[PDB]
Amino acid sequence: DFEEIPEEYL
Amino acid sequence: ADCGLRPLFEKKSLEDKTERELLESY
Amino acid sequence: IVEGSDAEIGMSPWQVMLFRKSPQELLCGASLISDRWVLTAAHCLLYPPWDKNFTENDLLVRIGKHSRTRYERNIEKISMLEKIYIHPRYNWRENLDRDIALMKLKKPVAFSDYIHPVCLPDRETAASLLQAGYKGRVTGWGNLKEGQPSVLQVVNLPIVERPVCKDSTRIRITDNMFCAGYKPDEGKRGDACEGDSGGPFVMKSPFNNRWYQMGIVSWGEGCDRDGKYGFYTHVFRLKKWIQKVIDQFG
Numbered sequence: 001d002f003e004e005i006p007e008e009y010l
Numbered sequence: 011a012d013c014g015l016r017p018l019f020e021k022k023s024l025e026d027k028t029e030r031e032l033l034e035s036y
Numbered sequence: 037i038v039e040g041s042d043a044e045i046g047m048s049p050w051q052v053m054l055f056r057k058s059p060q061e062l063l064c065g066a067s068l069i070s071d072r073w074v075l076t077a078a079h080c081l082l083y084p085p086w087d088k089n090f091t092e093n094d095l096l097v098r099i100g101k102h103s104r105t106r107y108e109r110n111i112e113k114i115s116m117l118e119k120i121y122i123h124p125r126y127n128w129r130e131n132l133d134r135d136i137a138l139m140k141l142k143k144p145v146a147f148s149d150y151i152h153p154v155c156l157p158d159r160e161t162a163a164s165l166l167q168a169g170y171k172g173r174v175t176g177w178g179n180l181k182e183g184q185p186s187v188l189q190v191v192n193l194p195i196v197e198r199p200v201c202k203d204s205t206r207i208r209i210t211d212n213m214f215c216a217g218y219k220p221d222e223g224k225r226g227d228a229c230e231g232d233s234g235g236p237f238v239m240k241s242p243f244n245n246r247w248y249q250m251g252i253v254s255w256g257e258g259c260d261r262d263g264k265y266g267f268y269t270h271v272f273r274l275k276k277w278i279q280k281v282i283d284q285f286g
């Protein structure tokens with residue numbers, strides 16, 4: 001159930 | 011230099027709810 | 037953390053979450069000891085029995101967090117790793133002796149109300165505080181039972197006599213380890229549990245008011261079992277390697 005982190009950090 | 015001093019606690023002279031339990035055992 | 041309670045905001049500003057990118061999941065706890073360096077347990081990154089061997093691109097460091105699953109916009113800061121350093125003598129084959137690893141962040145994190153490094157003990161600090169009966173504090177987002185919490189949990193736990201630690205297990209204890217937890221007849225209980233690996237066991241010095249990281253959540257058998265104790269990496273005993281790595285690498 002983790003919220004999506006900002007794409008940028010991936 | 012400033013390690014281990016919490017902005018929301020030691021720097022304002024505020025204690026968290028259980029750190030006295032720690033100090034009482036020392 | 038089993039039998040702990042919800043942390044207060046800003047109560048452990050050094051707590052770091054090690055987060056896997058794919059699948060997106062909490063791997064381990066960790067601690068911030070400077071703007072560029074994070075400390076965790078080596079078993080969080082390398083443990084061949086279970087085929088674990090994570091490198092830098094596999095992970096993200098999330099600092100300043102309170103909520104386990106939410107992306108705390110404008111509070112937390114996420115970082116990528118530049119390099120991982122595992123103690124060359126970490127003993128994953130036998131008893132997890134020297135369970136410790138340093139992580140070099142790609143760019144300095146800026147400190148704030150929710151992000152601030154813990155101190156590393158010196159000899160005098162370790163000698164005064166790492167005594168049987170003295171309590172330290174473990175924090176983490178790990179399991180509440182042997183579900184998972186919505187926010188960081190915290191528990192205060194007494195250091196235990198090395199004889200009693202040795203007599204509770206068949207695994208070989210070394211001087212690079214100490215154990216902590218309440219005795220089966222003390223009434224109080226609490227322990228770290230899965231997902232708390234790599235997190236900080238800290239103590240507040242009564243001489244200068246600072247928090248020092250005395251241990252790293254390393255191993256145990258179960259969570260909060262009676263007559264069993266949590267075992268921690270003794271951070272001062274491995275400090276010469278820490279200092280050697282940070283001044284040999286940045």
Ligand SMILES: CN[C@H](Cc1ccccc1)C(=O)N1CCC[C@H]1C(=O)NC[C@H]1CC[C@H](N)CC1
Nearest residue numbers: 079130131132228229230254255256257258259
């Ligand atoms: C579950 N037990 C094993 C016991 C062990 C200890 C040393 C060497 C081999 C096996 C363990 O702790 N570990 C196996 C390898 C990794 C480590 C672990 O799971 N540590 C996490 C701890 C979190 C807190 C919990 N109370 C105990 C386990």
